[PDB]
Structure formats: structure tokens, C-alpha cells
């Protein structure tokens, strides 16, 4: 009780000093960030040596007082003095004490049952240990060529996110009292908020610590590291024990976190979405963004939107680049061409147009590049370095591991090189590859012959032979490349040499973004053709625990099931704004208006007519018995409500299974039609998901009843509205302007509001109108 | 417990069988997955597990397959 009083009196003393008073008054609160930077700048010159000098003394250490007197005896066992009443050296409320007392309280101290609290705070570290438990071992030795520079996620963890948003999570989970109300992350990514805030908020221990450790928990460290060719981010945590220049170890890849495959699943998701945008070429800009913002991903423990995964994902695939290009995410330093990845290390030049002949006696324009340019090629199990000058490869070296992958590197990079022989081979190219069939769209030519090579096996041999072939001289024996990808060096290709080893990958920290052309082409950096149109033509539909919406062009939607699910979505979505909606009715305790709601009449005809009254009786019963506060489940009210509309008859027959066009919805008992999720706010109707954030008091949501309750917004500061703590905000009803302290000290006012709507579309439609 | 399967504590999932659908008996689980089976997922922290992460990953590979 005096803990606040003494703080108030301390403030009185401080503002009584004018020198501190004016510097406390003048300026924003941000000056604290500077003020803290003005202290304890002095550091000792010697890292260990000064510490040795420190521990030499018997009572060097600064330690707290109150806790020790509370728990344990200050005096010693062996009669070596421990405690005094004197505060010496720096003057702070801590009194000095000997080092060994720490060991004593670690021995005989009276503490119990801290075990479970520790681990899930440090689950980053504890997990990095758990993974080492399951692996097996083998030892050998070799002269090993490691891949020298890869920038690769190390210490990977599920639900990894950017630094700013993880700072938001930090603020929300640490303390509610001072926090800003942060829309973008909390609205979309809620349910990780529920978990983290739930486990860490109830037991107030080591607030700062837990914060700064959670910062590192979700932050994969991507550094520039040597790897020996196992690129899974789990092996990156401990490379040292595994591999090195002379090192080798075995039996690893098996154990991994669930992230590594989930990322690939997201790559397939972006594949299907980009195909959906490919189906209709009327406009590719307006549709794909809809397909993005609509889709909802289910991560193993959490539901998260596709937008915040795409924009903020680490790995840039040829597809992922396309999915990001629709949004405002800037990810550069990546070149994607077909399956191959590329990086540009040198030179520059302009795109020029040259019309060259095919074998069908027809002329088609080819856009080529004249530059002296040195780029690094990247393909599966193979790396290389190429340099092109004036539309023809100048210098080439291959660092690839496998012969076939070497040949693929050579080929693809010849396609991007576009020599004259590129025109000479045209075996039936025009009949199909010339005109891609999509609304009669002519597909670019580099990708045309790329696809011609991806077609069959002999097409690779064609252009492989299109390069000059010569018997290589002695001294090139090891560097020479056969037609089939080997080193025998009897016959070899011209202007190419293999290297024994791998080839290092360049890295640049850069962000570049520009809008995309209507054909799924990204002209970013005023050129550079990074989007590679369609990378791979996989026609397949397979998904697991994935959500789609809004005329997806994939038919998962039955007529009866869309009647049920949309009928529910009317009720769930349309309510929560104000009076004559579910929240005000629940606060009034009046459930009769809730029965008569016009959105229930929409759902009425879909119920089974036989038991309609028999269902309505038990339904009305359940809704009425939950009107008493604290006993009501807020999901069960949505589940049970639609059947209450009809006149209750005394059935005496059990109404557990409610047939709505021959499909049952049970109380509790999450099923195909109605999925009732535990300990988070959501729900699943077959292959799709919906939830309503602003007003949920459902009893299991206790941990965030302060975060979830917000549908509010800011209006004006004019009324004098009693200053209400965040826990007092649940009581003030609708249309009530109230005053609240926000964040780091800025105070604003709100009312019960219709939520912020059309953050994007509001601008997008007008921008489309102005053309 | 040396039996290859669990007896007393084992749990059942009932499906009314079609002659032409169940005649395969391999597709039986494919028609099972259209039910509630697909949703069940274990947590990362098992009770009494020897090799949790391996088994969990394999389970996800079964569900994906």
C-alpha cells in the first residue's frame, strides 16, 4: 500500500528540485530514451581481468536486502561475517554482502514447485536441447568442401515474425497497464496473443527478462555461414558438432521442427493462388490481392492470415516473389528464372529488341540484353558462376555436385543467355509452345524454349550440343565438362570449365519493390524481369487444414452447406455494432429480442420440419438458462440460437442432433458443420473459418478480456469522461464516450464503435476510378 | 505390453461401410478422413514419450499422405 505512496512522495521531492522539474516538464516522453543513455557509460577497460580484481575482495557484490531478511538468516554457519547495515561504494538502497551467501540460499533456501514455470519461458533454449536428445551418430574424416556463404535461418521457431510486430507482442504480453492499442497485428494474429499472454501474464516474475527472451524466441538468426550441404534450418543450430572443413556426422535430417515443411506448404499455397490469378487475364492485379487477403492459413498451433505470412516470410521462392509483389512487401536481392535462382554481381545495360528467325520461316521479336554482366547461378544440388556479354555467354564455371544437375544448370543458363543457336532449333515449337492457351495470350519466348527443353529428354541434348564441342587440352582434364555431365574430359563443351568444389553465393542487404504487369510479370527496378511468369506448371489440388473464401474458383461449396454456413455468418458477422444487436441484448439480459432477430428468420426455413418445435424448445431452454452471467458460453449461443425461432412445442424427444437440410449440429461436440474451438476465438464451418473479435466475454477468455473487448475507436476529447482503467472499460455501454490512458502516456477518448473498415479497398477503388 | 496392438485401452472409430467403397480397404481411411479424423493433432509435449518429435512429424506425414 505504501509502495505507491512512497513513489508519489518521491515524485514530490523530485519536482521540488527545479533543475529536475524543468527537465521533467519540457519535451515529449521520448526524452527518457535519451536520459537513460546518459548514465553508466563508464565501463572497465578489462573484461575478465577487472572481474578477477572484483571477485578478489570478499564482499564486492551488490545484492538486495529485504528478500534475504524475509526468507533467511543473514548470519553465517561458520562464523565468517556476512551482513552489515552499512551501504558503501555507490549509494543505493541495496546493502553489500559476501558472495558465498548466494550459494547458501541455493542450498538450504525454502522454495518449492518452480519447475513448470521455468521451461516454457525459455522453450527456445529448452527446445534446442530437446532436439539434441533424438539423433544418432557416426564419425569419419574427409577433405570437405563446404558451401562457404549461405544466409540461412538458424535457431528456427514456429510462427517467426518481424522485429516490430514481435515488439507489439512483447508489449501486449508483458503488461496491459501501459500498452498502445495496436490494430494490425492484434486483430489478425490473435490466438497467439491468447496463448502467450495467458501463460506469462498470471505469474508476475522476471518481467523484463521474459520480454527480452521472447524477442529472441521468435527471431531466427540468419547469418552468413559455411554449410556442407544440409540446408535445413534445424541442422544450422549446431553445425560445429556436425560439420566443418575436416568434420563429418550422420543420422540428422530426421528430427526437425514442424516449420520446415510448413514453409513448403505455403509455397504450394502461393502456387495455387497464382494459378487462380492466371485463370482470368481480364485483370491480374485486382483478383490476386483478393485471393491473398481472403485465404486463411492454419499453422499447427495457431490460425494466421496468408497476408502476414507472405509479406513477412523469410524464404523467397519464385512463387513467393509473385505473391509478395501484389502487396507492399519489399524483398529484393533475389532473381527467379524457372526452377533456377540467380543473383547479379556485375555490370549493367539496356534491354534491346532483336527479331531473329526460327526454322518455320517466321520472324518473332526477341528482347535481349547487351551488358558485360557476372551473375551467380543456383540450382538443385548445383551452383555455378556465369558472365554474359552482348547476348552470349562470356565466362562460365560450374561448381555443381551431381552431373544431371550440372547439365540442368548449363542448359537453363544458356536459355537466359540466348545465343544464336537458340533460334536454330525449332522442332514443332510453333504448333503449341508459340501460343500459350490462356485467353489467347502469347507467352514470352525465353520461357517458350525453356518449356521446350523441359518437355522431353532429347530437347536437352539438342541445345547441349548447340554449344561448341572440342576435345579439351591437357590441364583442363579436371575442369572439362562432358555432354552427360562428367569429368572424363574426352570431349567437352566450349567456354565452360568445372571447378572441383562448390561456388560461393553473394549476399546484399537491399529492399526493392514495384508494381506487377497484368501478365504476372514484375518489372521491379525498372526492368530485370524477376517474376519469370509461371515457374512450374503443376496442375494438382491437395490441401490440408487450409481455408479459402469468396468465389475461390475451386468448388468446395455445396448449396446446402453454403446455406447453413452463410446463414450462420449473417448472425455472427452482423452483430456486435450497437443496440438491437447481440451484445446489447446480452447486457440487457433480454433474450426475447435475440430470438426474434431478422437474421434468424433467414436461417429458419433450413431446419428439419419434423422436429422443428421439438428442437426449438431445447434451444430456447439453453439460451434462457445461460442468461445468468458467468454461466454462459458465447459460442454455444451462436450454435444453438438459429433453432429457437419456431414456436416451442413440448417434444419430450431428444433434440441433440439438429437436422438442417439433413445435417446435424450438436451442443458442444464440434463436428463437420460446427467446429467449437477451445481456448481461442474462432470457428470452422467445413473448409472455411470465421470469427467476430469485438465483444466476447465468454468465460474461457479471461486472460484477454481487456484485449478482446475492443471494437472501439477514437472520436473527440471534448466531454469530461471519468478516467476509466482498462478493466473498467467492459462496463461502459454502447454510444458512451469515455476517456482512457494510452500507451506510454498519451491519453485519448473513445466510444463503442463500428470497427475500422476498408483499410485497403477504400483507397484501391478510388485509385481505380481515377485511372 | 508385448502385443503388436493395444487391446483393452484401444479406441474405435465407427463407419458404416459401402460394398464398393470398402471393397478396397485401403481407401477405407481415405473415406474416414472426410470425417473428423483429419482434425486430430497431438501437442509437441507428450506424456511418457521416448521420441516425441519424430513420431509427431511422421503423424503429419501420414495425414498429408
Amino acid at each position: 500500500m505504501s509502495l505507491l505512496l512512497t513513489i508519489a512522495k518521491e515524485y514530490k521531492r523530485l519536482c521540488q528540485d527545479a533543475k529536475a522539474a524543468q527537465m521533467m516538464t519540457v519535451g515529449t516522453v521520448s526524452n527518457y530514451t535519451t536520459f537513460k543513455k546518459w548514465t553508466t557509460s563508464r565501463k572497465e577497460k578489462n573484461p575478465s581481468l577487472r572481474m578477477r580484481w572484483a571477485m578478489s575482495s570478499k564482499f564486492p557484490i551488490i545484492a538486495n536486502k529485504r528478500m534475504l531478511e524475509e526468507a533467511q538468516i543473514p548470519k553465517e554457519h561458520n562464523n565468517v561475517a556476512l551482513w552489515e547495515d552499512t551501504e558503501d561504494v555507490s549509494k543505493r538502497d541495496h546493502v553489500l554482502a559476501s558472495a558465498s551467501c548466494i550459494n547458501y540460499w541455493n542450498f538450504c533456501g525454502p522454495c518449492v514447485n518452480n519447475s513448470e514455470v521455468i521451461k516454457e519461458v525459455y522453450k527456445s533454449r529448452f527446445g534446442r536441447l530437446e532436439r539434441r536428445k533424438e539423433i544418432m551418430w557416426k564419425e569419419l574424416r574427409f577433405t570437405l568442401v563446404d558451401r562457404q556463404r549461405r544466409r540461412v535461418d538458424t535457431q528456427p521457431v514456429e510462427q517467426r515474425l518481424r522485429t516490430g510486430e514481435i515488439k507489439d507482442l512483447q508489449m501486449w504480453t508483458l503488461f496491459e497497464d501501459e500498452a498502445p492499442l495496436a490494430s494490425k497485428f492484434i486483430l489478425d494474429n490473435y490466438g497467439l496473443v491468447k496463448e502467450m499472454r495467458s501463460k506469462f501474464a498470471n505469474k508476475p516474475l522476471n518481467k523484463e527478462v521474459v520480454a527480452h527472451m521472447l524477442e529472441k524466441q521468435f527471431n531466427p538468426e540468419s547469418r552468413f555461414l559455411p554449410v556442407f550441404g544440409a540446408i535445413r534450418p534445424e541442422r544450422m543450430e549446431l553445425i560445429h558438432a556436425l560439420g566443418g572443413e575436416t568434420w563429418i556426422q550422420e543420422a540428422n535430417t530426421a528430427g526437425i521442427s514442424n516449420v520446415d515443411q510448413r514453409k513448403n506448404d505455403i509455397r504450394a499455397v502461393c502456387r495455387k493462388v497464382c494459378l487462380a490469378a492466371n485463370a482470368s487475364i481480364m485483370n491480374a492485379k485486382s483478383k490476386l490481392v483478393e485471393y491473398i487477403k481472403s485465404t486463411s492459413m492454419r499453422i499447427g498451433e495457431t490460425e494466421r492470415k496468408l497476408e502476414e505470412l507472405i509479406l513477412e516470410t523469410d524464404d523467397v521462392s519464385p512463387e513467393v516473389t509473385l505473391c509478395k509483389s501484389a502487396l507492399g512487401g519489399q524483398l529484393g536481392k533475389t532473381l527467379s528464372f524457372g526452377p533456377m535462382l540467380l543473383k547479379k554481381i556485375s555490370g549493367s545495360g539496356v534491354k534491346v529488341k532483336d527479331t531473329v528467325y526460327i526454322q518455320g520461316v517466321r520472324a518473332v521479336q526477341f528482347e535481349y540484353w547487351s551488358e558485360q554482366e557476372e551473375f551467380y547461378g543456383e540450382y538443385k544440388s548445383a551452383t555455378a558462376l556465369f558472365s554474359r556479354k552482348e547476348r552470349s555467354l562470356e565466362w562460365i564455371t560450374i561448381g555443381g555436385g551431381i552431373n544431371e544437375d550440372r547439365k540442368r544448370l548449363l542448359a537453363m543458363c544458356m536459355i537466359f543467355c540466348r545465343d544464336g543457336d537458340y533460334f536454330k532449333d525449332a522442332p514443332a515449337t510453333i504448333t503449341m509452345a508459340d501460343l500459350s492457351t490462356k485467353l489467347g495470350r502469347e507467352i514470352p519466348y525465353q520461357y517458350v524454349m525453356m518449356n521446350w527443353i523441359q518437355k522431353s529428354e532429347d530437347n536437352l541434348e539438342a541445345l547441349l550440343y548447340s554449344r561448341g564441342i572440342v576435345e579439351t587440352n591437357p590441364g583442363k582434364m579436371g575442369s572439362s565438362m562432358g555432354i552427360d555431365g562428367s569429368k572424363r574430359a574426352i570431349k567437352s563443351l566450349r567456354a565452360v570449365t568445372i571447378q572441383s568444389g562448390k561456388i560461393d553465393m553473394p549476399e546484399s542487404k537491399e529492399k526493392i519493390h514495384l508494381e506487377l504487369s497484368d501478365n504476372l510479370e514484375a518489372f521491379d527496378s525498372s526492368g530485370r524481369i524477376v517474376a519469370t511468369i509461371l515457374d512450374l506448371p503443376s496442375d494438382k489440388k491437395v490441401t490440408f487444414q487450409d481455408v479459402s473464401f469468396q468465389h475461390p474458383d475451386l468448388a468446395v461449396l455445396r448449396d446446402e452447406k453454403t446455406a447453413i454456413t452463410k446463414g450462420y455468418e449473417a448472425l455472427i458477422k452482423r452483430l456486435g455494432t450497437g443496440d438491437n444487436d447481440i451484445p446489447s441484448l446480452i447486457a440487457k439480459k433480454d433474450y426475447l429480442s435475440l430470438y426474434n432477430l431478422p437474421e434468424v428468420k433467414l436461417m429458419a426455413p433450413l431446419i428439419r420440419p419434423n422436429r422443428k418445435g421439438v428442437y426449438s424448445r431445447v434451444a430456447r431452454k439453453l439460451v434462457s438458462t445461460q442468461v445468468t452471467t458467468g454461466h454462459y458460453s458465447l459460442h454455444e449461443l451462436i450454435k444453438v440460437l438459429p433453432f429457437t425461432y419456431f414456436a416451442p412445442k413440448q417434444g419430450m424427444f431428444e433434440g441433440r442432433l439438429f437436422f438442417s437440410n439433413d445435417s446435424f449440429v450438436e451442443p458442444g461436440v464440434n463436428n463437420n458443420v460446427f467446429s467449437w474451438s477451445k481456448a481461442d476465438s474462432s470457428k470452422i464451418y467445413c473448409h472455411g473459418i470465421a470469427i467476430r473479435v469485438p465483444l466476447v466475454v465468454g468465460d474461457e477468455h479471461m486472460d484477454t478480456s481487456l484485449a478482446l473487448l475492443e471494437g472501439f475507436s477514437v472520436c473527440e476529447n471534448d466531454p469530461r469522461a471519468p478516467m476509466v482503467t482498462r478493466q473498467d472499460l467492459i462496463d461502459v455501454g454502447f454510444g458512451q464516450k469515455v476517456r482512457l490512458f494510452v500507451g506510454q502516456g498519451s491519453v485519448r477518448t473513445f466510444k463503442r464503435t463500428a470497427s475500422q473498415r476498408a483499410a485497403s479497398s477504400d483507397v484501391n477503388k478510388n485509385v481505380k476510378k481515377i485511372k | 505390453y508385448t502385443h503388436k496392438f493395444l487391446m483393452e485401452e484401444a479406441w474405435m472409430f465407427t463407419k458404416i461401410s459401402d460394398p464398393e467403397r470398402s471393397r478396397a480397404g485401403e481407401i477405407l481411411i481415405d473415406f474416414f478422413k472426410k470425417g473428423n479424423l483429419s482434425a486430430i493433432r497431438p501437442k509437441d509435449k507428450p506424456l511418457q514419450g521416448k521420441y516425441p518429435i519424430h513420431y509427431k512429424n511422421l503423424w503429419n506425414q501420414i495425414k498429408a499422405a
Partner: peptide
């Protein structure tokens, strides 16, 4: 608890 079959796809 004498209750064996359970789950129905329905």
C-alpha cells in the same frame, strides 16, 4: 464405461 464405437462421420 461400456461404450465402444463412438465417432460417426455422418
Amino acid at each position: 464405461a461400456a461404450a465402444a464405437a463412438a465417432a460417426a462421420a455422418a
